[PDB]
Design a binder for this molecule. Structure first.
Ligand SMILES: CC(C)(COP(=O)(O)OP(=O)(O)OC[C@H]1O[C@@H](n2cnc3c(N)ncnc32)[C@H](O)[C@@H]1OP(=O)(O)O)[C@@H](O)C(=O)NCCC(=O)NCCSCC(=O)c1ccc(O)cc1
Ligand SMILES: CC(C)(COP(=O)(O)OP(=O)(O)OC[C@H]1O[C@@H](n2cnc3c(N)ncnc32)[C@H](O)[C@@H]1OP(=O)(O)O)[C@@H](O)C(=O)NCCC(=O)NCCSCC(=O)c1ccc(O)cc1
Ligand SMILES: CC(C)(COP(=O)(O)OP(=O)(O)OC[C@H]1O[C@@H](n2cnc3c(N)ncnc32)[C@H](O)[C@@H]1OP(=O)(O)O)[C@@H](O)C(=O)NCCC(=O)NCCSCC(=O)c1ccc(O)cc1
Ligand SMILES: CC(C)(COP(=O)(O)OP(=O)(O)OC[C@H]1O[C@@H](n2cnc3c(N)ncnc32)[C@H](O)[C@@H]1OP(=O)(O)O)[C@@H](O)C(=O)NCCC(=O)NCCSCC(=O)c1ccc(O)cc1
Lengths: 140, 141, 140, 141
């Protein structure tokens, strides 16, 4: 179901209706320290100049990093949400795929930090995103 | 132009309705060399599975608005403008209504323009901010 | 005492020995939503190419933003520390002063966010820093 | 050169011992086009009043090391290199001992180089990271 971590019986929004399902994000691997995801480039991921949208690299990074955090902390009664995302853009992507790899670099009680690499089909580093993920007690 | 993006060219590689921005429904309202605003109606297409506006939607709205506000000035001078850095911080979730973005230009260098983008909900509350750095380079085209 | 907020009887490090006192940071105004500080440029604030050190704009922003948060939350039993600092550098400063103005934009239970402008003697915007300040219960 | 900064010029505007870097005691150890390391001994001059290493010291060490690692390559090609963006996040305080920085180059464009700098304490723990973006421009000099 994008292969997102299956941690609850019900979710407020179905995959195919989320921004994630609309653009086509799919999680490949997930462990507590490292996760990967990818997306096919289609026009839905593009801006009007024909390049993948800045927003798309950020969105990918945000979903991957946050859900990799959810995968661990949800069963502990915690919620996780993106608190900061800093994406820098080194080379455009015009077509093909964008592949993300999220590497956990700090896991604190209140904040987890992941470095996310975004690569094209040739494996070139096209963008990076520093995701900071707030972890808080789940509200009833 | 679809979504009211600056009309600086006779044709574009991708039509508004097919782009990310068209799909989620970004619309530019005001646009000047120093300030631009835009908004979007929150629908599931903007949300993630937990029912909140996706962190990506805030980045994407900031990026399009800051880059395009730059394009509006520099295109006719023979330059291209692309996002080189986006730093968004998230203060409060948005569940529904609209997200409204205001981009204020704070530095316009020869190679880099910098815009601060505030993203408010329907009550006026500041829900996210984005610092956009836009690279300006001469067109290869 | 740099005019930092006077919130405790004793501090681990005296002003004149801190990095702050060494380079000469002084707070001018402080309120819960807004604070200002400045520094004279001397070689101690410079790098070897003769420009004010990138580190100096960051340090100024960090001390101003954090201590403006301390000023409010300390009496509530909370500690405040910088969690993130993103500084962008628009124009160098060679001599004169650097003047900072910190404007609080979000004050949450666990995080306060301040935007800090760094200006030269002509009033030009030479750098900005986005400070994110973690606020936590003081440890005994 | 003082602090072992790259020797790329016959003279410099400010001597090592008088600079910020000289004052707090930054020392570069290794230095290659793709990776550079540096360290500093924590003393009060590096701390803020609450007794922790100042957030500014971590930025300053990252900035000097990333910029100078870039200078080392580009100076002899007629370019200058200055810090254009520094994003430091703080994971754990350092009270004493040393701070050790490792800068790894992750992108080397024609106008912008990007370095990830990790800042560890004496136990090897990751206490801060800094993302440094370095602008490369032709010298006016
Ligand atoms: C930011 C934060 C508090 C967030 O915590 P987190 O990501 O959830 O990490 P966690 O809470 O798991 O704890 C990590 C470590 O932080 C420290 N810490 C965390 N919470 C607390 C607390 N409530 N009280 C004391 N220490 C704490 C403690 O060292 C902890 O290690 P441990 O003893 O728990 O093993 C923690 O990452 C941290 O302390 N980071 C370092 C902040 C820092 O050192 N910034 C620079 C110094 S303060 C900024 C500044 O430059 C300044 C300059 C001048 C001036 O006058 C005032 C300020
Ligand atoms: C980064 C950049 C060059 C980009 O330029 P931009 O955003 O397109 O703005 P623009 O190019 O329009 O010019 C803005 C000003 O920057 C300066 N500048 C721009 N290009 C050049 C150049 N090629 N040569 C000299 N100065 C230049 C110049 O002051 C210019 O003003 P003007 O004389 O042209 O009116 C400019 O924004 C800038 O200079 N920012 C300040 C960089 C800075 O001062 N960072 C801190 C110091 S260097 C980093 C550091 O901490 C360090 C520490 C220790 C150490 O050993 C080494 C380094
Ligand atoms: C980050 C943080 C939790 C930090 O809290 P803070 O700075 O101390 O602010 P504070 O705790 O005072 O609360 C501010 C508001 O946040 C919410 N909040 C804070 N803590 C909690 C909590 N424990 N439980 C539920 N809501 C909370 C709540 O709306 C609160 O308002 P109020 O009802 O308390 O008046 C809060 O600023 C926040 O919630 N920010 C927004 C985070 C956000 O919306 N990010 C984007 C969505 S999640 C990231 C994502 O894109 C994603 C995509 C796909 C996917 O599959 C999964 C994730
Ligand atoms: C920002 C910059 C131009 C700076 O260049 P740099 O770091 O010095 O790297 P360099 O200049 O060495 O070139 C790297 C690659 O960038 C591209 N590039 C650089 N300069 C140019 C140029 N003048 N014209 C076209 N492409 C260029 C080119 O692909 C180049 O590769 P190569 O063909 O030269 O091998 C380059 O890093 C880059 O292009 N980054 C990607 C920018 C990007 O793709 N951001 C996202 C898309 S635009 C922002 C956006 O989301 C948006 C959304 C909606 C909308 O309506 C408008 C915009």
């Amino acid at each position: 179901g994008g292969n997102l971590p299956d941690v609850a019986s019900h979710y407020p929004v179905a995959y195919e209706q989320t921004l994630d399902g609309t653009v086509g994000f799919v999680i490949d691997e997930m462990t507590p320290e490292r996760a990967t995801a990818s997306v096919e480039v289609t026009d839905t991921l593009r801006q009007r100049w024909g390049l993948v949208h800045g927003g798309a690299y950020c969105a990918l990074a945000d979903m991957l990093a946050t859900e990799a955090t959810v995968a661990v902390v949800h069963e502990k009664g915690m919620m996780a949400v993106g608190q900061s995302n800093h994406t820098s853009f080194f080379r455009p992507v015009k077509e093909g795929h964008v592949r993300a790899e999220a590497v956990r670099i700090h896991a604190g009680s209140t904040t987890w930090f992941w470095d996310v690499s975004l690569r094209d089909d040739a494996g070139r580093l096209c963008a990076v995103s520093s995701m900071s993920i707030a972890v808080r007690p789940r509200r009833d």
